[PDB]
Design a protein around this ligand. Sequence first.
Ligand SMILES: CCCCCCCCCCCC(=O)O[C@@H](CCCCCCCCC)CC(=O)O[C@@H]1[C@@H](NC(=O)C[C@H](CCCCCCC)OC(=O)C[C@H](O)CCCCCCC)[C@H](OC[C@H]2O[C@H](OP(=O)(O)O)[C@H](NC(=O)C[C@@H](CCCCCCCC)OC(=O)CCCCCC)[C@@H](OC(=O)C[C@H](O)CCCCC)[C@@H]2O)O[C@H](CO[C@]2(C(=O)O)C[C@@H](O[C@]3(C(=O)O)C[C@@H](O)[C@@H](O)[C@@H]([C@H](O)CO)O3)[C@@H](O[C@]3(C(=O)O)C[C@@H](O[C@@H]4O[C@H](C(=O)O)[C@@H](O)[C@H](O)[C@H]4NC(C)=O)[C@@H](O)[C@@H]([C@H](O)CO)O3)[C@@H]([C@H](O)CO)O2)[C@H]1OP(=O)(O)O
Ligand SMILES: CCCCCCCCCCCCO[C@@H]1O[C@H](CO)[C@@H](O[C@H]2O[C@H](CO)[C@@H](O)[C@H](O)[C@H]2O)[C@H](O)[C@H]1O
Lengths: 239, 238, 316, 327
Amino acid sequence: QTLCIKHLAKNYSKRWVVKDVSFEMQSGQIVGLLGPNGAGKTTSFYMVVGLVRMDKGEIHLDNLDLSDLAMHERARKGIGYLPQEASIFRKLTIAENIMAILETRKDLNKQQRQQRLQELLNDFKITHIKDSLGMSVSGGERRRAEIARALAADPKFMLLDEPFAGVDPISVGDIKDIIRNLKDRGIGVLITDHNVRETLAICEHAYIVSEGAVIAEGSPQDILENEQVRKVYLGDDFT
Amino acid sequence: QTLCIKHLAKNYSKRWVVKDVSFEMQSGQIVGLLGPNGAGKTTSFYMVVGLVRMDKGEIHLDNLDLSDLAMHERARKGIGYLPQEASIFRKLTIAENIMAILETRKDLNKQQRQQRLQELLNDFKITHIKDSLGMSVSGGERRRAEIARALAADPKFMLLDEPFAGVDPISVGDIKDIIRNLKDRGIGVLITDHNVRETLAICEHAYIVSEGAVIAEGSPQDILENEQVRKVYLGDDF
Amino acid sequence: IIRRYLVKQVVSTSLVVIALLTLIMMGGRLIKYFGVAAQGRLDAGVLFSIIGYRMPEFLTLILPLGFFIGLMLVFGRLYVDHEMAVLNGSGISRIRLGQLLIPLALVFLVIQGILMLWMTPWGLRQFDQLSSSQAVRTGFDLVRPKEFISSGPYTIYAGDLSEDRKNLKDIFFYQDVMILAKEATRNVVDLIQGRRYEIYSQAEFQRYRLRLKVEALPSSKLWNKWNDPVIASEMGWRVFGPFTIVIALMMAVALCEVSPRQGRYYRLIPAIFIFASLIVLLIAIRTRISRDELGVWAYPAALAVYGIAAALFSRK
Amino acid sequence: RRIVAKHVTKTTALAMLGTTIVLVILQVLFTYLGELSNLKADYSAWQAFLYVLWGAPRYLYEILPISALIGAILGLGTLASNSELIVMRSVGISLWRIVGWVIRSALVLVLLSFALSEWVVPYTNERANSVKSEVRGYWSREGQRFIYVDYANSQGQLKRIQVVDFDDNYRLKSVTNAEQGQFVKDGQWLLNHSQQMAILALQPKYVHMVTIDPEDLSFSQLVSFMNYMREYSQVPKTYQLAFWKKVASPFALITLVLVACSFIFGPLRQQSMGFRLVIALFIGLGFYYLQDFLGYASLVYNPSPAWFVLGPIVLMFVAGSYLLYRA
Ligand SMILES: CCCCCCCCCCCC(=O)O[C@@H](CCCCCCCCC)CC(=O)O[C@@H]1[C@@H](NC(=O)C[C@H](CCCCCCC)OC(=O)C[C@H](O)CCCCCCC)[C@H](OC[C@H]2O[C@H](OP(=O)(O)O)[C@H](NC(=O)C[C@@H](CCCCCCCC)OC(=O)CCCCCC)[C@@H](OC(=O)C[C@H](O)CCCCC)[C@@H]2O)O[C@H](CO[C@]2(C(=O)O)C[C@@H](O[C@]3(C(=O)O)C[C@@H](O)[C@@H](O)[C@@H]([C@H](O)CO)O3)[C@@H](O[C@]3(C(=O)O)C[C@@H](O[C@@H]4O[C@H](C(=O)O)[C@@H](O)[C@H](O)[C@H]4NC(C)=O)[C@@H](O)[C@@H]([C@H](O)CO)O3)[C@@H]([C@H](O)CO)O2)[C@H]1OP(=O)(O)O
Ligand SMILES: CCCCCCCCCCCCO[C@@H]1O[C@H](CO)[C@@H](O[C@H]2O[C@H](CO)[C@@H](O)[C@H](O)[C@H]2O)[C@H](O)[C@H]1O
């Protein structure tokens, strides 16, 4: 499965924040939507998610158009969204957090819904907090619970917003391990983040968006050897 | 001139976020107050600024106690603060933004206040936007205007809150050059930031706060070879 | 789990908002009642009975408004706390949440139907009887200190008055019979150290004794008689009134899309104004039908216009 | 410091003026909606609209405290959410200096309230009453004398006078009656048919104020009329309450603005603009309800209305000062 996005466009008060952003992502790929801050990478990611309606654009998922579809319809088509901020249900426990999205699965019955919830809890090592509320867990545990809840919806493409945001370098490895699991389960993962250096360490195919247009495409090595990305975004020296 | 902080403490709903944070900074030094997120580095930095009052603590500025003083009193004593958010006056122009704080100076008259404003505008290359409103400037230009406005008050210790936040890697060099000119003016600079790796590249003396207590002290080279720091904060590979 | 989660949040916040709105509005009316009592035109010991009897009438408006505000608060919290992003990101639309809270809307509709059909008319008739009992007070009941009170053929002046409307001092009474007493206690009034004059007769004494709606009708009695425009208006109001709960549900689902930065309470005031506009339109239609100018058909039309507007806004 | 002060004062003043305009428009619309149900043959929709518009200055005078509160909340929330107050503190400007700037901004609304109370409300209220639609049966006491006139005018004429005299023993002395009367000088009135039984301080300037409620009276009229009583009779407690409510109106506005500033610097710091507006509305409703209830209670309880009127103001000022001390 592939998520083909072409010719994105959006203006804010007659100011085109995004101008012709086109990129392709396949299932089982960690594609990074990077670029200078405010250059349209965040807006492009949001229109891909469905939180910002496109002015001009075409979004496809295996020759199935999603441009006219709303965010929930796109999610039903197999697209997941992980907000950067705390998106956990405050008054629901972690097990209840996962089960609330699991109960919406039309192809799962309760007998196997319980098994899916148990294996999701065991996968992310959040079983010890299955009975604890979403507001009474640490940041890493809360993020793991959110990712398990998102996986409970069975998405084909998980769109991560700033996964490495406000996280210690010690837990950057844990987040990288998690986002490499999301690609071991087939879930294409689209990452937009300000922390580009550790984002490029997991991405298989990176996209750089400058002043609303995509200026680069390829593996992180190709981005790092580019003569324009290091001219507008990465700087002359970048390790 | 030194800014001595010792035995900071603060609790939130009977949860001690900060427990005995002590660090010293001198005028002319770029000291980094780092640590794992939510471990008390931000709360300690805020207590040093004066935004949140300290439950237990002692702050001194050249044998002058600032523990009982408020944020504005500490600022008048020679402490500067640069908020991470867009803190520019939206409806005041950049020249007006700097002049607004220059007028608060009691040792400057208007004849030399104009000269100080002109040289501050020329220093940070914001003269071309002197007549442009603060809400209609770019992020880098707005940050430079905010730093010039903070310097207009003539602080002895500039406390920067997340200077490398939402900044491109190409523009990190500009921020580093700016923070090194605040130290090349004699303005001790205290930096707290999640982006530790580019923070340690300018700091002369770094502090790591984990679970409310200071766990490290020394140059960034000493920090990077500290077992506890890379055991709880930096990780095995960094 | 998501349905019971949303129901719990909406019930809790709607109960909080209903209690807060009851306090605000009913105390604002109770303060006017207390001012009337302080002016002597109402008994201070019965204003709480008025509060009790007018509780159903105020709740008749607070319940839809409270439900609407609670729904707005819950959905704004979902949007602000990014819980709506993961709900939408899981295939659960906002309209899906509105449909999930349909049973709670039906429960509140049943509650407001109980209020409008039975509780509100009963409270209104009790309050009307109480007001008729309190509209007959006259004489020393309405006296105020250091002022002259004229009630029919009686002119009364009192130099002082206690915290309660008893134990008058420096009393001047006029009819023509003139009675001036140093003290008087309360119409049966016992005067102390007074002098009686007639205009010429004089009589001194140490003590003296002086002895000077369709909105409330039961729904059973108004179910028939649709031909009468007033009865028709009242019954249409009592029948189509409870559906404002459902209108509030589909309207707060429509007008709750708020960004995290704006906040949970950002869109409350415009949406509260829209709901109040709906209720004012309903009241105007009620008056128009009572004047035999619009007909009962306007109630479902008024509800359906706002419902269609809310549905179109929520599905744009 | 002038540019910071000018910026804060201008932003807060614009917020207060915008809130004032919005609230006046809303209360005119709501009053017209409430009056639209009271239409008759001689009171059409245009007549109701004219009555509401003529009452608009009175509505504005009633709003200005709440308008100033909400304006201070909105302006200081705009500054705080933009982190302008944070840098104002971080450069050496105290909380009390910003509060003083906001109070300087609200002094414009205080002056507007003074102007409306003295020169606009007394005339526009009369115009509104005339559009919707000098005292008969006036009963008055002057010391030990009770004076009743069935009809009096501002021009100085009396009809059906009835004056009854008394002593410390409350014994009848003279009951004089008349059919017509005229005013020539203070303390004496010429009249015909002087039927005096054997066993005046009325003034025609203050006749037109008898029908007017004490609250609706302007401060000049209220002070003169209370002085007239205190010279010739006992002033009612309602007039004292109205006087204490009018003299404490600018102080109430200033204290409410200070409370708004303290809330912005305190509990409402880092809150949403919508939440700040909702809390401002709640504080306005609470203050209006508290002042109305305590004004009503002053008329029923022994203590002077000054206590009941200056209680909320002093307590709110103390609470705001303490919240500002907590920074
Ligand atoms: C479908 C599902 C849902 C269904 C829902 C359906 C509805 C449910 C239903 C539930 C039940 C219900 O209803 O519940 C409520 C309603 C809920 C709201 C509506 C909701 C609708 C739905 C949509 C949401 C109760 C109600 O309705 O109560 C009215 C009362 N109304 C109000 O109080 C209005 C506002 C409501 C505001 C609504 C809009 C805003 C919110 C959306 O507050 C409240 O509701 C209380 C509370 O706080 C509300 C909080 C809300 C919070 C919301 C939060 C989300 C009424 O008050 C009279 C007047 O009071 C004030 O003005 P002033 O008086 O000081 O001048 C009021 N201003 C003020 O306070 C100023 C305050 C406003 C209030 C406080 C703030 C609120 C803020 C909210 C956000 O702002 C400020 O400060 C500034 C802002 C501060 C806050 C800022 C945040 C006046 O408001 C206005 O203008 C409008 C407001 O500004 C708008 C607000 C705008 C804010 C921006 C008011 O109109 O008095 C009425 C009775 O009154 C009578 C009676 O009949 O018994 C009649 C009176 O007479 C008059 C009249 O004056 O009206 C003149 C007559 O000529 C005639 O026309 C006559 C008549 O026309 C009949 O014809 O009316 C009067 O009579 C006497 C008197 O002496 O005075 C003798 C008279 O003499 C004789 O009269 C006889 C007669 O005619 O009877 C004649 O026969 C005789 O021949 C004649 N003989 C001679 C000799 O003359 C005469 O002399 C007269 C004269 O006036 C002189 O005094 O005086 C009175 C007496 O006082 C005793 O009270 O008695 C009550 O009704 P009830 O009791 O029946 O309940
Ligand atoms: C669709 C039509 C246009 C809608 C416009 C937008 C409306 C927004 C909300 C308006 C709310 C105002 O609400 C209005 O408040 C007034 C206050 O004077 C109430 O009026 C109240 O006081 C008056 C004053 O005498 C009493 O006569 C009346 O019995 C009482 O209800 C009205 O009953 C209510 O309709």
